[PDB]
Amino acid sequence: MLLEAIFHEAKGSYAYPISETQLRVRLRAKKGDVVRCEVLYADRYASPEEELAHALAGKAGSDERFDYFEALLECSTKRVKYVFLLTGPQGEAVYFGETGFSAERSKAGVFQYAYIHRSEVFTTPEWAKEAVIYQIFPERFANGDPSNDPPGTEQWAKDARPRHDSFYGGDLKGVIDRLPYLEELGVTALYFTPIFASPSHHKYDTADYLAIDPQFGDLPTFRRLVDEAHRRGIKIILDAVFNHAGDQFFAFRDVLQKGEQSRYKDWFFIEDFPVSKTSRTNYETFAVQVPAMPKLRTENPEVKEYLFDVARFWMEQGIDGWRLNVANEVDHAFWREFRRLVKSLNPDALIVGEIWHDASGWLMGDQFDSVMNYLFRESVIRFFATGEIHAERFDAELTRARMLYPEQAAQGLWNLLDSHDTERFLTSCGGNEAKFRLAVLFQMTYLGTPLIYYGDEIGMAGATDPDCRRPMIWEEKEQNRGLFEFYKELIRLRHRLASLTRGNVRSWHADKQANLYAFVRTVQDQHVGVVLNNRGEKQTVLLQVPESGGKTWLDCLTGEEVHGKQGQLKLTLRPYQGMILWNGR
Amino acid sequence: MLLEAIFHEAKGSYAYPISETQLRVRLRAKKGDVVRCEVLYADRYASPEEELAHALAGKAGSDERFDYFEALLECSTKRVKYVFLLTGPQGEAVYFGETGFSAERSKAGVFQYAYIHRSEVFTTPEWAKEAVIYQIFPERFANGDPSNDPPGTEQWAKDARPRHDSFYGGDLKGVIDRLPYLEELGVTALYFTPIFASPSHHKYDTADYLAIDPQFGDLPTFRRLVDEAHRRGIKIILDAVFNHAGDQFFAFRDVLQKGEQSRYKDWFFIEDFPVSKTSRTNYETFAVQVPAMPKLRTENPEVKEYLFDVARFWMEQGIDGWRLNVANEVDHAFWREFRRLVKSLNPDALIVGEIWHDASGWLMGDQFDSVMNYLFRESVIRFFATGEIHAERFDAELTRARMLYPEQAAQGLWNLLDSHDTERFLTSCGGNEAKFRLAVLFQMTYLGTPLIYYGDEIGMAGATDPDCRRPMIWEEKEQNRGLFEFYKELIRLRHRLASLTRGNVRSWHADKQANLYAFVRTVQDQHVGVVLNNRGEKQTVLLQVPESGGKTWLDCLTGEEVHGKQGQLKLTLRPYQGMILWNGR
Ligand SMILES: OC[C@H]1O[C@H](O[C@H]2[C@H](O)[C@@H](O)[C@@H](O[C@H]3[C@H](O)[C@@H](O)[C@@H](O[C@H]4[C@H](O)[C@@H](O)[C@@H](O[C@H]5[C@H](O)[C@@H](O)[C@@H](O[C@H]6[C@H](O)[C@@H](O)[C@H](O)O[C@@H]6CO)O[C@@H]5CO)O[C@@H]4CO)O[C@@H]3CO)O[C@@H]2CO)[C@H](O)[C@@H](O)[C@@H]1O
Ligand SMILES: OC[C@H]1O[C@H](O[C@H]2[C@H](O)[C@@H](O)[C@@H](O[C@H]3[C@H](O)[C@@H](O)[C@@H](O[C@H]4[C@H](O)[C@@H](O)[C@@H](O[C@H]5[C@H](O)[C@@H](O)[C@@H](O[C@H]6[C@H](O)[C@@H](O)[C@H](O)O[C@@H]6CO)O[C@@H]5CO)O[C@@H]4CO)O[C@@H]3CO)O[C@@H]2CO)[C@H](O)[C@@H](O)[C@@H]1O
Ligand SMILES: [Ca+2]
Ligand SMILES: [Ca+2]
Secondary structure, eight states: OOGGGOBOOSSTTTEEESSSSEEEEEEEEETTTOSEEEEEEEOTTOOTTSOOEEEEEEEEEEOSSEEEEEEEEEOTTSOEEEEEEEEOTTSOEEEEOSSOEESSHHHHOOEEEOOOOGGGSOOOOTGGGGOOEEEEOGGGTOOSOGGGOOTTOOOOOTTOOOOTTOOOOOOHHHHHHTHHHHHHHTOOEEEEOOOEEOSSSSOOSOSEEEEEOTTTOOHHHHHHHHHHHHTTTOEEEEEEOOSBOOTTSHHHHHHHHHGGGOTTGGGBOBOSSSOOSSSSOSBOBSTTTOTTOBBBOTTSHHHHHHHHHHHHHHHHTTOOEEEETTGGGSOHHHHHHHHHHHHHHOTTOEEEEOOSSOOGGGOSSSSOSEEBOHHHHHHHIIIIISOOSOHHHHHHHHHHHHTTSOHHHHTTOEEESOOTTSOOHHHHTTTOHHHHHHHHHHHHHSSSEEEEETTGGGTOOOOSTTTTSOOOOOOGGGSOHHHHHHHHHHHHHHHHOHHHHHOEEEEEEEETTTTEEEEEEEETTEEEEEEEEOSSSOEEEEEEOOTTOOSEEEETTTTEEEEOSSSEEEEEEOTTOEEEEEOOO | OOGGGOBOOSSTTTEEEEETTEEEEEEEEETTTOSEEEEEEEOTTOOTTSOOEEEEEEEEEEOSSEEEEEEEEEOTTSOEEEEEEEEOTTOOEEEEOSSOEESSHHHHOOEEEOOOOGGGSOOOOGGGGGOOEEEEOGGGTOOSOGGGOOTTOOOOOTTOOOOTTOOOOOOHHHHHHTHHHHHHHTOOEEEEOOOEEOSSSSOOSOSEEEEEOTTTOOHHHHHHHHHHHHTTTOEEEEEEOOSBOOTTSHHHHHHHHHGGGOTTGGGSOBOSSSOOOTTOOSBOBSSSSOTTOBBOOTTSHHHHHHHHHHHHHHHHTTOOEEEETTGGGSOHHHHHHHHHHHHHHOTTOEEEEOOSSOOGGGOSSSSOSEEBOHHHHHHHIIIIISOOSOHHHHHHHHHHHHTTSOHHHHTTOEEESOOTTSOOHHHHTTTOHHHHHHHHHHHTTSSSEEEEETTGGGTOOOOSTTTTOOOOOOOGGGSOHHHHHHHHHHHHHHHHOHHHHHOEEEEEEEETTTTEEEEEEEETTEEEEEEEEOSSSOEEEEEEOOTTOOSOEEETTTTEEEOOSSSEEEEEEOTTOEEEEEOOO
């Protein structure tokens, strides 16, 4: 075996508790190098002559180059020291501990997980595990009150082609009027892009954090929305824009006016005074030269105090969580304290960070509960949309991503197909509905929480910002109702099958030539196998009956009954068809 | 190129800032696999049309299986995305990024270090880097006041054999009396084990955190000690026992008397009432069944404020830092807040955690400045004391350990040979002074902060606790004055050669056959090469002139001049001899 390929660390995503007395440990090795991985462990103060406890680590996954083994250690003392015993195909064995590798156990040393503090066990809101999120970009969802429309509003039509400065009149009253639709779809939570006072259509350049934007409504209307959504079983998630403010933010205007004499100058990153001349900003902003968005110095206790108050105010209005804008450019201390504040006010309030890359640094349990899973989007884009990768590469990317974070984070990642910052997924699929649907079926059955971008469910299309922000299509005749009913069925099944929301996930089959991919979701005695024929050709495949699942399966999408023949299942898939096989338990 | 052996993560010790605009990045590959490692980077919002910046990563080290490449990225924007370009021996070129490996750069993706916040740049007290610490176990150092001696105090003699419950009368007045001695040795800081009220001789079972133990003195005496040490250029570090209290601690006494009625019952981990009764404890304690040490629930905000108050009190007395007892069993939040409290009170107060294993989780910059480096001791024991490993594995263990933490931590790690919890190092060497001295020579020249265990400098020996806590030997005739003078010279040298305190470290030469180990310390134009002949036979060797060090060298220990012919130095080392070759700059 290739020892240079073996990896483990007593922290992060390779060692973490799932309870106050149980520790999950993972180990990585070159694919095929290790057939048996066992963990020998004991209390960190156990005597030299005490027997070590044993825990066998099953193979939890494999990507292109590695195998990932996982075990559960029962640590009643909450203190554990442990070593791995790795066995190869030829029976060659070796111990792997903190000191290194050795045939002699004592020489390998022991990894140590010092202490398991209850306060450090990653815990997330129970409801977030089985939620189906629907993203609403207010200015474009529904114009329920044209009397608050901004001047110059354009026509709310299917042929609308938004500009960076277009307005259509979307508002909160509209959202309220359309709740019956959202409820019928099966949505359980709504994520809103900024809704606080701001001059733009997107409103990421905040003028006033404590006020609902006039064109969207007022506090009484917001409160009504929260109540109407809640009694319909729908939660509310707001967009927290704490990385930067708008240039109309009071503190910033003060600096613009008083400059060096401003009591708020240290609330930002001003390069020199006066504050500006044009787009040539002499102050740090979001991205590059974005005059309307001066970066906030969240490291300043005054700024942190202010934003924390903003958070308190809105949570008082009854919201259920936050979506953190550009979360990765706000300091960690801020986020650790934010989590403490939020959870103290509402233990069930969800915290989702908006980060597009590897977000492990914010997903260990003391900061966010989840993140906008763009890694998931990329793999889904490449596999179902552009066809840039095949099923085996898809399986690998998913597996590698799953191993990036502790299971508590993975279980609730917001798996989106697109957002208000990307082209519509149907457009990514070049308008191919068959491909789009397969992606959706995957999104609705995979490990994580699905996030639906408004309109995708009724066939909307579009290029990237601002063309992805076109007015919602409400005209029944202009909506893809077949797709809508498709979504409804998938969402109902998700709520219907426990393994789909709370089950683990394991690869079942991945064939690069047939481009068929299958995985199994498991919890308790229930097993649900999802098979995706990601090819424009009808195919048949023989899959091994999933580990301890039973001999009778039912494709919940068709009512088709399939029996295990000599430990196998014969499946015939039409082009781009997906099956959701329930083992009946 | 074995891709399965290549590793990098955009955080931890593989990617971290050394300043507000500079990110240090490290990458490891199978030893020999990569000949050139380059980093191509840019601002995270740079246009796809902009050209990437270039940074060549030199080989910063190599262990038994890997090569470690290190580079410095200039990030004026404080936001960076990057990809590695690795070239094999044959000229093979592969790109490595967050997405994976590929001959095509774009397909490799890019790692991202979202933002560099000034508050997250690991910063340590400037003085700690060039310090030489002396550890004082007060009950056994010096009895300056015989009137405060504990009951049954035993004879202060060289033939003393301490028992777990012995007392010899050591106190703070004695330390004050021996300051001229400590100053002569050249020590710059004193690390004291517990000195607060406690009934034991070690005092890790705290009765009163706010009072000097009567056997050791009183507050005024402590203050005088602080002042007398300070005026002699000696700082003071106290032992903070925050993981557990003594069973005579006021809060615990209360729980013992009032039980479930006690307002302090949640300050501990009580399983049932009434509490205690012999060694069969019904409450969690340090280690296993240690009735005198009930664990403190530092997660409890009341417990945390009390301890923080304890820390504020002693810092008001003028101390310079803390040594955190069993730091790995106290929660991370407590430690993050502790650091902010401490640093706000005294920016130069040092925080050293007592952790015996990989302490990377506490050394990223938001918790401890350093730790008692027991990993260093293990390597030193195996190589110099037991001879269990040869020069090449020694070099490997050292390099591997060095790569475990960011450079800010490594530079000030407390490198000890032994402690009040281990057998004396001389005893580890089986009484061999030649091996002992070579280890000390290594300790005084290697990267990190040397920690001297009281008595080792004058030849004390002893088995592990309690035998390693023998009363100090003060009678000159019973002291190894030759050793003492050796220590003095090495300490002076360390203070005189900037590279020994502020320089980096790189392997120079390691040969298992001759068991010769050499490394070089470098800062600016100063290069100091250390050659250790760890064998009991006179030997001669040839070493390539230290990279860009120059051609004139001087062994500071003897005054011997070495010129080096054709880029090589000819060295003749006596048995267990060591050389400290200064390049003259
Ligand atoms: O010409 C300037 C610009 O102006 C307008 O943009 C404004 C926008 O309309 C408005 O809504 C707002 O934008 C906010 C946005 O809505 C929020 O969701 C958020 O979005 C920003 C992200 O938070 C931020 O991280 C970044 O995103 C970049 C990723 O970080 C980066 O990783 C990369 O993504 C790639 C991944 O790295 C890779 O792993 C994966 O495979 O591929 C990804 C790319 O496909 O690149 C991302 C894009 O830079 O920027 C996001 C903003 O776009 O915060 C925003 C700010 O509040 O304000 C905007 C500024 O005024 C126009 O609409 C826009 O077209 C125009 O470019
Ligand atoms: O039966 C009674 C008991 O009495 C004595 O113990 C008491 C001791 O005399 C007294 O001073 C005090 O002890 C404290 C000690 O002085 C402090 O420094 C500290 O020490 C404890 C450590 O903090 C704690 O982590 C642990 O140490 C363990 C290491 O974590 C663990 O890694 C492992 O160490 C190995 C290293 O990893 C490796 O690098 C090296 O090569 O080999 C090591 C050996 O395995 O094991 C360590 C031992 O478990 O315990 C330390 C305590 O010894 O905190 C202490 C508590 O405040 O109180 C003691 C209890 O009353 C005797 O000394 C003891 O033998 C006897 O059993
Ligand atoms: Ca309107
Ligand atoms: Ca005394």
